[PDB]
Amino acid sequence: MASWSHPQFEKIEGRMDVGQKVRVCRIRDRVAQDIIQKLGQVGQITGFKMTDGSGVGVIVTFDDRSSTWFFEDEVEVVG
């Protein structure tokens, strides 16, 4: 469902890109045992995700071969 709507990116359009690497700098709300591992760890954007917590989410695949989602402001873009 979209009718004619294009991929919706507000500010992340020219900041967050698939293939670019990102590092989790700060966990905004709650930190899980798994998430805390990724905190300070560098991963790569493999896609975007929709969230109901803060709008847009970013799917980051790390060197652990695991892919998890983080928020727009929750990560920094590197590489």
Side-chain angles (χ1 to χ4, degrees):
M1 187 284 297
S3 187
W4 66 265
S5 186
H6 62 79
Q8 180 177 329
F9 306 109
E10 25 71 281
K11 62 179 180 297
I12 58 174
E13 190 189 290
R15 311 301 180 244
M16 315 296 294
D17 177 74
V18 293
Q20 277 285 268
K21 289 181 179 61
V22 287
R23 178 171 56 202
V24 192
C25 320
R26 51 185 179 260
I27 302 176
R28 308 171 312 139
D29 42 269
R30 75 278 294 164
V31 45
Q33 186 180 331
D34 187 282
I35 311 179
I36 193 175
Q37 188 192 331
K38 312 256 79 73
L39 194 284
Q41 191 179 330
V42 180
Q44 176 164 327
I45 304 176
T46 49
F48 294 91
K49 202 188 183 68
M50 62 290 179
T51 60
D52 61 289
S54 301
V56 296
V58 188
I59 299 178
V60 188
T61 306
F62 293 77
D63 53 273
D64 301 290
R65 295 183 176 212
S66 311
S67 53
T68 179
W69 52 284
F70 286 102
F71 287 81
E72 35 161 281
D73 189 84
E74 188 153 75
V75 295
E76 67 184 284
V77 187
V78 294

